Structure formats: structure tokens, C-alpha cells
Amino acid sequence: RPATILTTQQRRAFKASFEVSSKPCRKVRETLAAETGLSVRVVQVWFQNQRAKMKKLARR
DNA sequence: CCATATTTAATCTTC
DNA sequence: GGAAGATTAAATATG
């Protein structure tokens, strides 16, 4: 249950795909999980928090 | 239409 | 004290 703290390489992989789509399909999340070595749930949640981060930034 | 999955909005937790 | 990760319940989307 300890919270995830991403390495640089892992965060770089997340931001690069988020640049392609803010909502990766399960297949994309699945191959992200293999690359980063993290669970699919961690992948899904990182994008969710990231999408919520950009929504606030778009509201002045 | 219906069962299941994904996303949203808000919040809680933790470093 | 601030940001990001994790949780929740409700809303929306999907097959």
C-alpha cells in the first residue's frame, strides 16, 4: 500500500504518451505498465491526476 | 436496453 | 505548506 514515487524514466514515459492522448486505451495502459514496470491501476491513475491538473490550468 | 468499464469531481493521504 | 498519488461516489461511456 505505499504510494508510488515515479523515477524520471517512468515519468518521462507517461508525459510522452499523455502528449499523444490524455486517455490511453486499456491496451495502451497495458503496454505502459510493462514498460514502466508499474501496475495498470497506477498508470490509469497517473493520467487521471494529470488530466485533472491540466483542467485547473485551463480555468485561469 | 443492459452489464460492465471508464471518466469525472471531489476529496483524502502522504511525502 | 504544496504537489502528486490514491480513494471515493457519482456520472458517463462502452460492448
PDB file of C-alpha atoms (C1' of nucleotides) in Angstrom:
ATOM      1  CA  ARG A   1       0.000   0.000   0.000  1.00  0.00           C
ATOM      2  CA  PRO A   2       2.828   2.634  -0.043  1.00  0.00           C
ATOM      3  CA  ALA A   3       2.248   5.386  -2.580  1.00  0.00           C
ATOM      4  CA  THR A   4       4.096   5.348  -5.896  1.00  0.00           C
ATOM      5  CA  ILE A   5       7.050   7.683  -6.462  1.00  0.00           C
ATOM      6  CA  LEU A   6       7.976   7.614 -10.138  1.00  0.00           C
ATOM      7  CA  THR A   7      11.509   7.547 -11.445  1.00  0.00           C
ATOM      8  CA  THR A   8      12.490  10.104 -14.070  1.00  0.00           C
ATOM      9  CA  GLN A   9      12.391   7.488 -16.832  1.00  0.00           C
ATOM     10  CA  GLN A  10       8.899   6.392 -15.771  1.00  0.00           C
ATOM     11  CA  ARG A  11       7.525   9.942 -15.629  1.00  0.00           C
ATOM     12  CA  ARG A  12       9.135  10.723 -18.994  1.00  0.00           C
ATOM     13  CA  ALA A  13       7.270   7.756 -20.500  1.00  0.00           C
ATOM     14  CA  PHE A  14       3.952   8.908 -19.012  1.00  0.00           C
ATOM     15  CA  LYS A  15       4.263  12.507 -20.233  1.00  0.00           C
ATOM     16  CA  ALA A  16       5.285  11.355 -23.714  1.00  0.00           C
ATOM     17  CA  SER A  17       2.142   9.255 -24.145  1.00  0.00           C
ATOM     18  CA  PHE A  18      -0.069  11.885 -22.496  1.00  0.00           C
ATOM     19  CA  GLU A  19       1.251  14.154 -25.249  1.00  0.00           C
ATOM     20  CA  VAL A  20      -0.303  11.695 -27.719  1.00  0.00           C
ATOM     21  CA  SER A  21      -3.595  11.159 -25.862  1.00  0.00           C
ATOM     22  CA  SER A  22      -4.805  12.131 -22.388  1.00  0.00           C
ATOM     23  CA  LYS A  23      -6.952   8.952 -22.291  1.00  0.00           C
ATOM     24  CA  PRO A  24      -4.957   5.842 -23.232  1.00  0.00           C
ATOM     25  CA  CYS A  25      -6.974   2.746 -24.018  1.00  0.00           C
ATOM     26  CA  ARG A  26      -6.573  -0.346 -21.841  1.00  0.00           C
ATOM     27  CA  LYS A  27      -4.192  -1.833 -24.415  1.00  0.00           C
ATOM     28  CA  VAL A  28      -2.010   1.289 -24.260  1.00  0.00           C
ATOM     29  CA  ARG A  29      -2.112   1.339 -20.457  1.00  0.00           C
ATOM     30  CA  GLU A  30      -1.193  -2.352 -20.570  1.00  0.00           C
ATOM     31  CA  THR A  31       1.944  -1.754 -22.643  1.00  0.00           C
ATOM     32  CA  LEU A  32       2.765   1.271 -20.484  1.00  0.00           C
ATOM     33  CA  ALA A  33       2.597  -0.962 -17.409  1.00  0.00           C
ATOM     34  CA  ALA A  34       5.061  -3.394 -18.988  1.00  0.00           C
ATOM     35  CA  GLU A  35       7.454  -0.605 -19.978  1.00  0.00           C
ATOM     36  CA  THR A  36       7.403   1.225 -16.640  1.00  0.00           C
ATOM     37  CA  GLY A  37       7.068  -1.922 -14.526  1.00  0.00           C
ATOM     38  CA  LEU A  38       4.088  -0.444 -12.665  1.00  0.00           C
ATOM     39  CA  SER A  39       0.557  -1.745 -12.288  1.00  0.00           C
ATOM     40  CA  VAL A  40      -2.182  -0.849 -14.753  1.00  0.00           C
ATOM     41  CA  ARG A  41      -4.037   0.907 -11.930  1.00  0.00           C
ATOM     42  CA  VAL A  42      -1.061   3.198 -11.280  1.00  0.00           C
ATOM     43  CA  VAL A  43      -0.962   4.028 -15.000  1.00  0.00           C
ATOM     44  CA  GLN A  44      -4.702   4.758 -15.090  1.00  0.00           C
ATOM     45  CA  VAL A  45      -4.469   6.979 -12.006  1.00  0.00           C
ATOM     46  CA  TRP A  46      -1.421   8.968 -13.145  1.00  0.00           C
ATOM     47  CA  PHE A  47      -3.318  10.012 -16.275  1.00  0.00           C
ATOM     48  CA  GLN A  48      -6.428  10.844 -14.231  1.00  0.00           C
ATOM     49  CA  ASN A  49      -4.470  13.090 -11.855  1.00  0.00           C
ATOM     50  CA  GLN A  50      -2.651  14.581 -14.853  1.00  0.00           C
ATOM     51  CA  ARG A  51      -5.905  15.342 -16.688  1.00  0.00           C
ATOM     52  CA  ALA A  52      -7.235  16.979 -13.521  1.00  0.00           C
ATOM     53  CA  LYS A  53      -4.019  19.006 -13.324  1.00  0.00           C
ATOM     54  CA  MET A  54      -4.458  20.437 -16.824  1.00  0.00           C
ATOM     55  CA  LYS A  55      -8.165  21.171 -16.312  1.00  0.00           C
ATOM     56  CA  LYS A  56      -7.398  23.551 -13.443  1.00  0.00           C
ATOM     57  CA  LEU A  57      -4.609  25.119 -15.509  1.00  0.00           C
ATOM     58  CA  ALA A  58      -7.162  25.807 -18.262  1.00  0.00           C
ATOM     59  CA  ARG A  59      -9.503  27.651 -15.849  1.00  0.00           C
ATOM     60  CA  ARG A  60      -7.417  30.826 -15.414  1.00  0.00           C
TER      61      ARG A  60
ATOM     62  C1'  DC B   1     -31.721  -1.773 -23.453  1.00  0.00           C
ATOM     63  C1'  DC B   2     -28.419  -4.000 -20.230  1.00  0.00           C
ATOM     64  C1'  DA B   3     -23.908  -5.191 -17.727  1.00  0.00           C
ATOM     65  C1'  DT B   4     -19.567  -3.601 -17.249  1.00  0.00           C
ATOM     66  C1'  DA B   5     -15.842  -0.106 -17.797  1.00  0.00           C
ATOM     67  C1'  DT B   6     -14.199   4.323 -17.926  1.00  0.00           C
ATOM     68  C1'  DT B   7     -14.253   9.002 -16.606  1.00  0.00           C
ATOM     69  C1'  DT B   8     -15.406  12.798 -13.775  1.00  0.00           C
ATOM     70  C1'  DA B   9     -15.339  15.737  -9.495  1.00  0.00           C
ATOM     71  C1'  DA B  10     -14.055  15.950  -5.138  1.00  0.00           C
ATOM     72  C1'  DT B  11     -11.593  14.627  -1.579  1.00  0.00           C
ATOM     73  C1'  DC B  12      -8.112  12.127   1.325  1.00  0.00           C
ATOM     74  C1'  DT B  13      -3.401  10.777   2.039  1.00  0.00           C
ATOM     75  C1'  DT B  14       1.348  11.104   2.111  1.00  0.00           C
ATOM     76  C1'  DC B  15       5.952  12.716   1.181  1.00  0.00           C
TER      77       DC B  15
ATOM     78  C1'  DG C   1       2.637  24.081   3.429  1.00  0.00           C
ATOM     79  C1'  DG C   2       2.366  22.325  -1.544  1.00  0.00           C
ATOM     80  C1'  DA C   3       2.099  18.902  -5.068  1.00  0.00           C
ATOM     81  C1'  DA C   4       1.026  14.478  -6.545  1.00  0.00           C
ATOM     82  C1'  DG C   5      -0.594   9.899  -5.600  1.00  0.00           C
ATOM     83  C1'  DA C   6      -4.629   7.335  -4.027  1.00  0.00           C
ATOM     84  C1'  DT C   7      -9.599   6.835  -2.825  1.00  0.00           C
ATOM     85  C1'  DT C   8     -14.433   7.630  -3.232  1.00  0.00           C
ATOM     86  C1'  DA C   9     -19.095   8.049  -5.231  1.00  0.00           C
ATOM     87  C1'  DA C  10     -21.443   9.641  -8.967  1.00  0.00           C
ATOM     88  C1'  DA C  11     -21.734  10.365 -13.803  1.00  0.00           C
ATOM     89  C1'  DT C  12     -20.733   8.984 -18.331  1.00  0.00           C
ATOM     90  C1'  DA C  13     -19.147   5.810 -21.877  1.00  0.00           C
ATOM     91  C1'  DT C  14     -18.734   1.266 -23.897  1.00  0.00           C
ATOM     92  C1'  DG C  15     -19.598  -3.519 -25.922  1.00  0.00           C
TER      93       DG C  15
END
